[PDB]
Amino acid sequence: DSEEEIREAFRVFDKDGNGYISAAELRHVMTNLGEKLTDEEVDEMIREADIDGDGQVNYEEFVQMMTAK
Numbered sequence: 730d731s732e733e734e735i736r737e738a739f740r741v742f743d744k745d746g747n748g749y750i751s752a753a754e755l756r757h758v759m760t761n762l763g764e765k766l767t768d769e770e771v772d773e774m775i776r777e778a779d780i781d782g783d784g785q786v787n788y789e790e791f792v793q794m795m796t797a798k
């Protein structure tokens with residue numbers, strides 16, 4: 730239910746389907762979705778979820794970001 734919803738949310742931003750949200754994909758999705766965010770804000774959203782520091786948000790980091798209170 731909520732797990733499936735989180736998976737679809739992740740698939741919204743993993744534009745190429747390789748399992749990692751990159752800064753380029755996030756920028757493209759935000760621009761395509763009509764959201765008003767600067768490029769620095771996109772890079773900051775990536776940095777906040779990037780626990781392992783590889784520069785991309787995998788599925789588990791995304792889950793942590795969504796399921797954290």
Ligand SMILES: Nc1ncnc2c1ncn2[C@@H]1O[C@H](COP(=O)(O)OP(=O)(O)O)[C@@H](O)[C@H]1O
Nearest residue numbers: 736739740743744745746747748749750787788
């Ligand atoms: N090259 C790959 N090798 C193994 N697993 C991959 C690969 N690319 C993506 N995945 C995994 O498969 C998931 C995407 O599955 P699916 O939705 O079937 O792909 P697509 O979005 O290409 O249709 C990703 O979230 C990731 O976990």
Ligand SMILES: [Ca+2]
Nearest residue numbers: 743745747749
């Ligand atoms: Ca990707």
Ligand SMILES: [Ca+2]
Nearest residue numbers: 783785786787
């Ligand atoms: Ca990462």
